[PDB]
C-alpha cells in the first residue's frame, strides 16, 4: 500500500496536479508524525528496559508530543 | 452585536491559549447552516408551544374566545420568527469557524438517543 494510496484515502476523506502534490506532502507529514511517535515509544520503552512497546508507552509519548503542539 | 465577525474573533482569541495559532479562518459550510437552522426550528417550535400553553387564558379573555385571532397571531409570530431566522442565517453566512464540525457532531436528538441506548445497556448489564 503506497503513499499514493494514503493520498487517495485523504482525498476521499475530503470529498488538480497541484492539489495532488499538496496531499502527497500531507501524507509525507502524516508518515513523519507516525515515525516520530514510534521513535518516542521505543525511547521510553528502552528507558524502562522493555524490548517491545505497549499502549500506555505510546499514549504517554503522544500526549507529550501534543503537549508541545 | 449584529457584527458577528468581531465577536467571533474576540471570543476565539479570549477562549483559546496564546500558542493556539488561528491561521486558517473558514466560512461555515452548508451542513453547518442546515444543522443550526434545524436546531433553531425545533427549539422555536418547542418555545412557541410552551408560551402559548402558558399564556392561553389571557389570550382567550382578551379575544373573548375568538380562536381565529389566536391562530392569526400564531401565524404572525411564526412569520416574525421565520424572518428572524432568515436574518440570522444571512448574518452567519458571513462568519468564520473551523470545518471540523459535521452534522453528527452537533445534533441534540442523535446524541440523546445514543445516551439513552448506552444507559439502557448499562442498566441491563447491571441487572444481569
Amino acid at each position: 500500500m503506497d503513499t499514493e494510496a494514503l493520498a487517495n484515502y485523504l482525498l476521499r476523506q475530503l470529498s488538480s496536479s497541484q492539489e495532488y502534490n499538496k496531499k502527497l506532502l500531507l501524507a509525507c507529514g502524516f508518515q513523519a508524525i507516525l515515525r516520530k511517535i514510534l521513535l518516542d515509544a521505543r525511547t521510553r520503552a528502552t528507558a524502562e528496559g522493555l524490548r517491545e512497546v505497549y499502549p500506555y508507552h505510546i499514549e504517554a509519548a503522544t500526549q507529550a508530543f501534543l503537549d508541545s503542539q | 452585536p449584529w457584527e458577528f465577525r468581531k465577536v467571533i474573533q474576540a471570543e476565539y482569541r479570549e477562549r483559546l491559549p496564546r500558542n493556539y495559532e488561528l491561521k486558517h479562518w473558514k466560512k461555515p459550510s452548508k451542513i453547518m447552516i442546515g444543522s443550526i437552522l434545524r436546531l433553531l426550528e425545533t427549539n422555536t417550535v418547542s418555545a412557541l408551544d410552551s408560551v402559548f400553553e402558558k399564556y392561553e387564558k389571557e389570550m382567550n379573555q382578551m379575544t373573548h374566545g375568538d380562536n381565529n385571532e389566536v391562530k392569526r397571531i400564531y401565524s404572525k409570530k411564526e412569520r416574525l420568527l421565520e424572518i428572524i431566522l432568515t436574518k440570522i442565517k444571512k448574518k452567519l453566512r458571513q462568519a468564520k469557524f473551523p470545518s471540523r464540525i459535521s452534522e453528527r457532531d452537533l445534533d441534540i436528538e442523535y446524541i440523546y438517543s445514543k445516551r439513552q441506548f448506552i444507559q439502557n445497556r448499562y442498566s441491563q448489564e447491571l441487572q444481569n
Binding site: - | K54, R115, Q119, N120, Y122, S123, Q124, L126, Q127
Partner: protein, 57 residues
C-alpha cells in the same frame, strides 16, 4: 425489573427538568421580566458542575 433506568429517568424527568421549568415559571409569575432573567442568570451561574449529567449519573 430494570431499576437503574427507572431511577435515572425519574431523576432526569421529575428532578432537573421539573426544577428548571418550575423555577422559570415561578420567577416569571412572582410579580418582573428583567428581575427574572437576572436571577435566573446567577442561579444558573452558581449551579455549575452540579446539574450536569455527570452529577446525575
Amino acid at each position: 425489573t430494570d431499576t437503574y433506568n427507572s431511577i435515572s429517568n425519574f431523576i432526569e424527568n421529575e428532578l432537573t427538568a421539573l426544577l428548571s421549568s418550575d423555577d422559570y415559571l415561578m420567577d416569571d409569575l412572582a410579580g418582573p421580566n428583567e428581575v427574572c432573567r437576572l436571577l435566573k442568570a446567577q442561579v444558573i451561574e452558581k449551579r455549575k458542575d452540579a446539574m450536569s449529567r455527570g452529577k446525575q449519573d
